[PDB]
Design a protein around this ligand. Structure first.
Ligand SMILES: CC(=O)N[C@@H]1[C@@H](O)[C@H](O)[C@@H](CO)O[C@H]1O
Ligand SMILES: *[C@@H]1O[C@H](CO)[C@@H](O)[C@H](O)[C@H]1NC(C)=O
Ligand SMILES: O=P(O)(O)OC[C@@H](O)CO
Ligand SMILES: O=P(O)(O)OC[C@@H](O)CO
Lengths: 146, 141
């Protein structure tokens, strides 16, 4: 399961508030041909098929190259008025961008009082996230409501 | 005449900045903590926040003596729009003295869609990086 970065029982409780999503699998594909990437995200569970401990991976559809965007063994989580921010650090280092630092995944879970979990997608396409050196994603969930 | 300076430029982020102009003139504030250690957070969109912090977009004010600590500068701005929320980031703040590796402070502000107010309810979420939030119909789409 998710391992908190650092004990903030506040974040611990939050991981528990999110367990109803652990077994679900979210995917979103952005961009057009030659050039199309598929993002697979999971909550405190393996997201890739060639990785270990990946929380969110990027898959180049042209050749299936799977890049780890963030790991759930380095999780951070915060709760706003009607959203929950989930962060997965320790992803693969950029090859020739953003100072070759480790990739990081940020998922903004917005309160949606009519779905337990739905509409996951990057806040991009893949020709903008790398430019901004920020993998920002979003999804809906009543779990993010308060 | 100094406005937000996009980090890095990204006509999408420049458009978002224009979309947020109605807030430039407004002032946001929220106080946390109990005497005598209360802090006041002042936030402004593409304008200066405190009274003694040039280029500061968001400042932490010690209510006891008014000492200002810069959390983020609007000349190192980043902005993203999701579906029913806009994220505003201000970097280049005063570096920590004994925390986060002396690391320059950063301000992350989650502007949530609220169809019933142009701007309101600004307050910190948690105090690395400082996470804040507020409501605005401008973040509604
Ligand atoms: C990199 C950049 O443009 N940000 C500037 C920084 O260099 C400067 O030290 C600070 C104080 O004027 O204001 C901001
Ligand atoms: C998280 O897992 C990665 C991959 O094995 C590893 O390199 C890193 O040291 C781990 N970090 C923690 C929190 O143990
Ligand atoms: O297709 P996504 O956006 O990943 O949502 C899947 C979820 O509805 C499965 O229960
Ligand atoms: O109290 P805050 O959150 O700073 O909002 C003030 C704003 O409503 C003034 O027009």
């Amino acid at each position: 399961t998710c391992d908190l970065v650092g004990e903030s029982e506040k974040q611990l409780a939050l991981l528990k508030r999110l367990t109803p999503l652990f077994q679900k699998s979210f995917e979103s594909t952005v961009g057009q041909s030659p050039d199309m990437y598929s993002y697979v995200f999971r909550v405190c569970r393996e997201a890739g098929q060639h990785s270990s401990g990946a929380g969110l991976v990027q898959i180049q559809k042209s050749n299936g190259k799977e890049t780890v965007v963030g790991r759930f063994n380095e999780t951070q989580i915060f709760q706003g008025s009607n959203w929950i921010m989930l962060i997965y650090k320790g992803g693969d280092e950029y090859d020739n961008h953003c100072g070759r630092e480790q990739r990081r995944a940020v998922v903004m879970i917005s309160c949606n009082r009519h779905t337990l979990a739905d509409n996951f997608n990057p806040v991009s396409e893949e020709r903008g996230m790398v430019q901004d050196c920020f993998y920002l994603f979003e999804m809906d969930s009543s779990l993010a409501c308060s």
